[PDB]
Structures are given as C-alpha cells and as structure tokens.
Amino acid sequence: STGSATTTPIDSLDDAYITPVQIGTPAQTLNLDFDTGSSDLWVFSSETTASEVDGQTIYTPSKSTTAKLLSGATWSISYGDGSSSSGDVYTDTVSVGGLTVTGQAVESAKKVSSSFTEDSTIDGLLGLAFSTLNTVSPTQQKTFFDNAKASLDSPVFTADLGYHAPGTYNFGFIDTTAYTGSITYTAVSTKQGFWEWTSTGYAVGSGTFKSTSIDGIADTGTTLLYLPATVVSAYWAQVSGAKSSSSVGGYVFPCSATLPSFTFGVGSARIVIPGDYIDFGPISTGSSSCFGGIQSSAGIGINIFGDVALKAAFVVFNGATTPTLGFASK
Template sequence: MQPVSFGSFLVTFLTASLAAGSALPNTVSSPGSFEIKRTPNKGFTGRNGPLALARAYVKYGVPVSKSLVEAIDLVKSAQLIKRSNGNVTATPDGDDLQYLVPVQIGTPPQTLHLDFDTGSSDLWVFSSETDPSSSKGHSLYNPSTSTSSKKVDGASWNITYGDQSSSSGDVYTDVVTVGSLTVNSQAVESAQQVSAQFAQGNNDGLVGLAFSSINTVKPTPQKTWFDNIASTLDAPLFVADLRHETPGSYIFGAIPSAASNILYAPVDNSKGFWQFSTSSDTGGEFDAIADTGTTLILASDALVKSYYQKVQGAHLDALQGGYVFGCNTTLPDFKFAVGEGEITVPGSLINYAPAGNNECFGGIQPSGGLPFAIFGDIALKAAHVVFDSGKTQVGWAQKK
C-alpha cells in the first residue's frame, strides 16, 4: 500500500494568474525561485486531537480503535455546541484542516483547494467524474472544459487506506499553476470514487511532495509536480516555513535569509519519503519522516512514555485515544538531533488541543508500532525545514 495524506494544519497558497495558451508537453515556466504565502481555510472548525491522531494512523496503515473514533465525535460535538452560540454556522470538517492550497488547473484555469503533503506523491483531485454523492460541496476539476487536458490512455490510480476505504480514478495531463510557476503537462489524477471521510472534508484533493517513486499511477508512475519543476529552479529544493496560528509560507528554489545555521541530515528515500536518522534524550536513536501532511509528532511507545513522565498528571486516556494532561501544565521542550546539532520543539507547541474536563491533547503521541517516527507540523513549525532533492538531504534551521 502506498500511503497518502490529507493532513491537518496544512499550508495554503496565494493564487496567481495563469496566462492562457497551448500546453506543451514537458515544458515548465519558472522564475527560478519564489515564495508562496499560506492563508486560512475558512471551513476550519477547530483542532481535534483524536482526529489528527486517527488521520495519521490511517495514512500509515495503523488500525484505528473504536474508542479513538468515539473520541473524535465527542470533540466535534463540543465544537458544534460552542459555535452554535455565536453567529457562525458550524460546518463539520472531516479533515481537521486549518490550511488549504488554491491551485489552478487547466485552460482556462479552474481553482481547487488542495493539500501540500511531503508524505505522498500523487496530485489527485475531486472532479466532474467523481460520484455526485461524494463531490457535493467541493470545487471540481472538469477536464472536458479544459482545452489543454489530455487523457492518459490506460492509466489509473487506486489508493487504499488503513481502514480499507479507497480513492480511485483515471489520469489526465494538464496545465497546473501554483504561485508564479506553471507546469504545462502535469499528471492530474481525477477521482471517480472517494471514501466518505474525505468526501465530508473541505479539501478538493492534494499535491504530493514526496519522491516520485511512490506515485500510485499504473501502469506507469507519474512525476510529482515538484519533480517536474525542480530542474528549472535556482536550486532543486523547497523550504517549509510553517508557523503557529499565523500564516507561513513555502519557498521554492532558494533558502530564505531567516534560515541560518542549518543542520543537515542525509535522506534515505528508498521508501519514497523524506526519511532521516535522528535521536533524542527520551528515545535513543531512530528514523523519522518529515511530513507536512501529518499534524502531530508520532514516535515509539517508549519515547512518548518517557516524555510524558516529565509532565505531572499526564496519562494515556483510553477515551481520548492518546496522552492528555492539564491544560495549564507547562510542557517540557522536545529535542532531537539533526546532523551534528539539535533542534528544539517548544513545549508550547506540544499542547495541541482541548480534550474536555480542563485537559488537553498532546502533540506527541504513540506511533502504533510503525518502524519510524513521523515529524508532522508540530515539529516542522519549530524550524525552517529544507527539502533538498538535489543533494538528497533535509535541513533544519531553528527558529528563534
């Protein structure tokens, strides 16, 4: 199974105009380097700790317990009750996404709101081919109205998730524009069937930024959007500048001046991920994946238990499906090694979301037996993170 993500707390980008014109295969226009700001998802209804954990489990094939599903519903119910007392109509957000990505596809351009995910390698979208029962409320890509679309004969994709739900469809090539950059012949995977949990969310699909080797299109895997534009950039890399409760950005092709004293670690991309070796004083040595498509930090039972032993009153709550603690508790920092140095994730970022009864849900949770840790947005927000495909390395520059 190739994992895929619709991770929470993702970036969204400012939309740029697309000049109409004929699509030329394998042609890319690029300014060399550019920055794309993110903006909020207006449909975001609030952080849901159990949901963020369950979505990470589903992505990587870890079973989701009944109690965790029930905890998700409890948090959603509390959010809806709270919002019903104000002037905002509450809309359940099945994906718990705080940020989405406006991306333009086709000629003339059709704008869809997608996730950018370094933990997967497919660009797939809700479309006019999607079962109408699943596509309600989504912006749709309609290849029949795009003069630059071309169907890839015999190509299909089928992604199966850990709960055995799936998304599948056929494949087109078309113009795809993000920010000031256009790929004129990008594989766009058009969904025909979409599982219920994603149909209920606000996102219209995703843009995978992992390595093309795990793209799920058959019989011939397709290049990711980033792999198509990497050679035209000043440097074949991008930098995630995610921030806490304030807009951040992605920078493509250059490293911003604010990213100083960068610590680098070689990437093992044999499984298609941005995976590197690290260590911490609470968990020894281990491998980790830098994943913008996951919200939380997931790690071994031993590491997580060791961390929360430092937190008075913290406990593994079966009803919440994870570790909780008093919301007024000051959490310790979490530190991990990168190369010859160390990155610190402030304890304030690890206090993720209210869990009821004056308790909060932790941003570090057990990985469910995975052979690697997952460093999601909570870890990524502590640094400028460099995804360097040219040198096959990941860099972390501590934010002040």
C-alpha cells in the first residue's frame, strides 16, 4: 500500500504545516501537524476542556462506530518549546492520503497548553519519530508509520515541505519526479528515539565549506534551524546589523537586509537553504527588526534540522530494519 497527502503551511511564515487526516467511521477529518520529532498522535476532542478549545476541529469518539476506549491508558507530553498536552486514549481507524491503519492509538486531549489553544489551525499532532518515545502509559503505543509499515510497498515515508507553498508527505514510495539529481543517504541513530544523523559541515553564502560533524535531528515539527553557537555566529556575522537579542529570544536582523544562503552537508552532498527561507519577518507587527530562521541550539541540548532546513530538500525517512535518512535537492 501507499499514501500521499498534501501538507499546507498554517500561515505566511511557514510556522508549521498541517495535513488532513481521516479518523473514525464515518471519517472525521482533522488537520494535524506531522512531527518527525515526537511519537504521539493526539487530537483536540470532545473531551478537551472547553475553555482550551478555540476554533479547532475536534474528534468525537462517541460518533465513530470504530472507536474503542483503550481502557486505563493515559498520555502526557511536553515539547521542546514548552508546550504540552495530556489525556486518555482510543483506538480507531486512521487514514492519511489513502493509507489506512486500523487499531491506531488516537490520544484524546483532556488538556492542552496555551500555545495549542491559541493556534486554531492545528487540530493535533501526528508523531513520526520512533515509537520508543510514545508517551502512552502503561502500554506504550505505536506510531501511525510503525503500524502501517508492514503493509507499505517500501518501509519509508518522505517529507517534501514547501517554501510559502504546499508540499507533500508520501508513505510507502519514493516519488522520483519530486527531486533533482540523486538522493544521498546517511546513517541514523535511534538511541534517543529521533531521526538523528550527522551533517558533514556547512557554508555561509558563497563562502568556503567547513567540514565539521554536526549531530542533530530531522524534525518537521520544529520551525527553525537550531545549530551550535559557533555556526550560528558565523552565519549572522555576514548580515550587517544582525545581533543576538536576549529580550527577543534569539538573533534578529534589520528587515532591510538581504540574507545569505546557508549550505549544510549530507555526506559529500550539499543542501542549499536560500537566504529568503531564513527570514521570519518582523519581531512584532510593523517592526523593522526581523527574526532569524537560524538560531543557536545552545541550551536545547540537541541540534535541530527543522523546517527551515528540511523544506530546502526532498527528505526520505527510511524505516527499514537499519533506518537511514536521505536528502535530495529539488
């Protein structure tokens, strides 16, 4: 089997991407944030505290003939940005882009933090990291990809995120028309439950490539590119007036700037992030200070190849017995 679904930016900055997902019978379509940095499929629901719902579409298990309470199971998750959610669990039928999983754990939110409430466009998350990170207790549950895997033509999914445009998540096949040149594959460590890999270096603009190992995670659920302070300082030093602002929470730059590209290494291959992808616009409405799309990972504890990096590539998440990651230009 295969699936193919379009993913759409939630706003003009590509802060996140939503993908329609069919849950239950008859189908209830929710727009979920596909997140390769976590492993829970959770939704706003009829059980979510009413004051914490503001415009989201909810899953109502009582209206699904295929929903079953997973008795005794609860979940609770906290994300890198400080947001969180928690609740109980149903199993139900879940379909993405024509690919159907029966008996998928659908984690129903009883509580969500402010960031989720305030984002009316995201109806929940669909985790695509390794199932070892799944938070369901006392019986850990599998991700949608893990459940689908054996039925897929090939045990892979691909992320093809757009810059200020829709893109695609495919399951079970590699669309050879969606990228240019060849795909370069690189080793993955699953030790921390992430799609963790080691970049071979970087360049700033038209500068020379610096060969250096940068361990980090491919994370579709993180907006920005978070890299070591050394690398990030080297990037922003090429932008007149750029500075790190503790008051704002990272590097800012004059909105009048033309940003240089940033290149990262995948083996002997190179992925170029155009300068425009690194512009996250005014820090507040009407400001002439703009927020940078490359930020320091210092104090996160991990480097994160978030959407800024991933949207510059066609990315293969190969979930074969020995998983790997592939990157192609596009």
